[PDB]
Amino acid sequence: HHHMSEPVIKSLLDTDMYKITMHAAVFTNFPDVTVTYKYTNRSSQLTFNKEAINWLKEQFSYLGNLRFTEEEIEYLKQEIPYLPSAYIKYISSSNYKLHPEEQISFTSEEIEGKPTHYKLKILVSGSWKDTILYEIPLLSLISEAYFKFVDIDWDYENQLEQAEKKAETLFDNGIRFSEFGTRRRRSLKAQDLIMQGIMKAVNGNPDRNKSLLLGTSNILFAKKYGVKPIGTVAHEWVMGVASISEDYLHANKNAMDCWINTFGAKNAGLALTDTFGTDDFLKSFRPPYSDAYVGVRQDSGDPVEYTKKISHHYHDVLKLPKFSKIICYSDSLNVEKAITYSHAAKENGMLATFGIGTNFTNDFRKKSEPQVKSEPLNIVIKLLEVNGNHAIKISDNLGKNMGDPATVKRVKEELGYT
């Protein structure tokens, strides 16, 4: 007889802070809009078994049992005080919950020519306010499933020490960074152990190191370890804003307006510039917008080239003093890259911060072959459709786009790239 598994996702705060701020933004501005997200496994030679699938089915259902506790809501009000009152009331209500049975469509398919091996098919669809939170916990669960049931050639030895060493190097180089690895963690336990390592590093020289650790994107771990939760706007914000009525020409400005009108200009945070290409973004990035945002988040393309472009914009076009604004580098970082990019930022008169994700929470060697990498699962859950319209991303890697090709072509034309 089957015994029910212990739920892995024990809190609606076991997620990235950007999910909650998006949730507040979507609730506030677009409570009616409907969306679909889609899972994609970019590592398609990595496959699933029946055991993993059955555990996933169970774990997904448990998401429907979660509620924000009193202490959790208090934590949100304290650390994210600019969340609107009405949003807090909405998530505080006894009416609030996730409905995975209605929102998640999870099937699996035996792979042609690979019997006993399966690919996952996952669509998450419904009102945007009902669907926005699933991305992170679903990814966190799928990764955990894969390393629990499919690839077990690995263990936890030296995970804390490895994270500690990374953190110590970063701190010696005066690097201001946050942990950002929730979505691709090998397991909840893996992320907890790396949090332990980072804090062990901090507490070796807290007078110096406390101010270098910005915090973690994971609100639950921020709460647990007594550090700040860290978040920015995500791509899905301007993608949704554009797709609602397919006004791409004004989407960057409309998205900033809406963000600012929701949280307040002072709480605008870092701007994500590359969604429809950084050039389009820059056309509207002047006062008051460029004064409200405290900087920009770099998420694609060549980081050094990005840094030069942004520096010229701020210092030459906008006539701001050097070191007025931040670039946050967040695309597949490791310690050596963070150091290199910190140099480029300094050279170009920019303050630098870093979000370090998968390298923290999914850096494992094989147990069988300790010199060989145990590869992470390269999975995403991406916004696909909004009110029936295609959702797309251009990025700054200009021929590496996301979404319906015809739409991407049409948009590049409308925005003057082509």
The contact set with Cl ion (CB under 5 A) reads 41, 119-120
Q: Which is nearer to Cl ion, 105 or 245 (CB)?
A: 105
To Cl ion, the closest distance from the beta carbon of 4 in angstroms equals: 24
User: Would you say 120 or 222 has its CB closer to Cl ion?
Assistant: 120
Report in angstroms how near the CB of residue 223 gets to Cl ion at its nearest: 32
By beta-carbon distance, which residue lies closest to Cl ion? 41
In the structure encoding, which two tokens stand for residue 204, read together? Answer: 């070796």
Q: How far apart (Å, rounded) are the C-alpha atoms in residues 22 and 234?
A: 8
Tell me the closest approach of the beta carbon of residue 246 to Cl ion, in angstroms: 31
41 or 307: CB nearest Cl ion: 41
| 285 assigned to a ligand binding site | no
Residue 358 annotated as part of some ligand binding site: yes
Q: Is 18 annotated as a binding residue?
A: yes
Distance CA 104, CA 61 (A): 9
Give the largest CA-CA distance in the chain: 70
Residue pointed to by tokens 């809501």: 73
Nearer to Cl ion by C-beta: 351 or 380? 380
Would you say 40 or 92 has its CB closer to Cl ion?
A: 40
At closest approach, how far in Å is the CB of 48 from Cl ion? Answer: 6
Taking the complex as a whole, the smallest distance from the CB of residue 122 to Cl ion amounts, in Å, to 9
**Least distance to Cl ion, CB of residue 379, Å:** 7
Going from the C-alpha of 100 to that of each of 50, 58, 116, 119, 366, the distances in angstroms are: 20, 11, 27, 20, 34
117 vs 337 by CB, closer to Cl ion? 117
Q: How far is CA 64 from CA 101, 104, 381, 405, in A?
A: 8, 11, 19, 35
Is 232 marked within a binding site?
yes
Take residue 177 and report the two structure tokens written for it.
């960074």
Angle, CA 379 vertex, CA 272 and CA 125 arms, to 5°: 75
Tell me: is residue 21 an annotated ligand-binding position.
Answer: no
Residue 248 CB partners (closer than 8 Å, separation 6+)? 242, 276, 411, 414, 415
Residue ranges for the binding site?
18, 180, 232, 297, 358
Which segments are annotated as binding site for 5-phospho-alpha-D-ribose 1-diphosphate? 358
Binding residues for nicotinate: 18, 180, 232, 297
